[PDB]
Amino acid sequence: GSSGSSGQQMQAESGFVQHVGFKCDNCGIEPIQGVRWHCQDCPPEMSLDFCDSCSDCLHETDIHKEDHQLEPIYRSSGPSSG
């Protein structure tokens, strides 16, 4: 059991992961804060991303479908050069 909500203010700050570039393909929230649900079924090119809010939502597109699965991405993992 888990569920959280928030508006649009002082969001980008010590509290939740701020994913830049990734936008929710459900509501349209970008950047995506918190956990970024990245589809697993979809290809690496047509990879989708849903916000924790739209994590329990169902979206079906040309490629994406309801059967497809989603991966809860808490923190963003990259090269972190430097």
Chain residues binding Zn ion by CB under 5 A are 24, 26-27, 29, 39, 41-42, 51, 53-54, 64, 68
Q: Which is nearer to Zn ion, 35 or 51 (CB)?
A: 51
Which tokens hold the place of 16? 């939740």
Q: Which is nearer to Zn ion, 12 or 80 (CB)?
A: 12
At 54, is the secondary structure helix, strand, or coil?
helix
Amino acid at 39: C
Q: Least distance to Zn ion from the beta carbon of 2, Å?
A: 16
Q: Which is nearer to Zn ion, 6 or 15 (CB)?
A: 6
Main-chain dihedrals φ then ψ at residue 52, nearest 5 degrees: -40, -35
Q: Least distance to Zn ion from the beta carbon of 11, Å?
A: 14
- 62 Rama class: left (phi>0) / alpha (psi -120 to 50) / beta: alpha
